């Protein structure tokens, strides 16, 4: 719950949104627009949508009180992807790559 730990989270979030990772991060930038994409079963399968723009809003609004709450939202975003999409799908390979970025930097959390 320290300021320092939340700044580490904010750094991770900025990195996930940065051009460095855009080739595989872009499916996670905005909420899944199920209607626009023709995914009429998406909200029957995914109970708690999450995406990086929502994480960013919650960070800016000071919604997150500790790093664990932030990590749970980021991991929820990936979990939704793993739930809705077959494991051999391109978007799942992108999720795995971005989650690799997230988990290895999140592990460097200041104590």
């Amino acid at each position: 719950g320290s300021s320092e730990q939340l700044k580490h989270c904010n750094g991770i979030l900025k990195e996930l949104l940065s051009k460095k990772h855009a080739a595989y991060a872009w499916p996670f930038y905005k909420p899944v627009d199920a209607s626009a994409l023709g995914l009429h079963d998406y909200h029957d399968i995914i109970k708690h949508p999450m995406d990086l723009s929502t994480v960013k809003r919650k960070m800016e609004n000071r919604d997150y009180r500790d790093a664990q709450e932030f990590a749970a939202d980021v991991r929820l975003m990936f979990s939704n992807c793993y739930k809705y999409n077959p494991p051999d799908h391109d978007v799942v390979a992108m999720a795995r790559k971005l989650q690799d970025v997230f988990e290895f930097r999140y592990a460097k959390m200041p104590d």
Partner: peptide, 6 residues
């Protein structure tokens, strides 16, 4: 099965 291929 999931989204359209990206």
């Amino acid at each position: 099965g999931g989204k359209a291929g990206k």
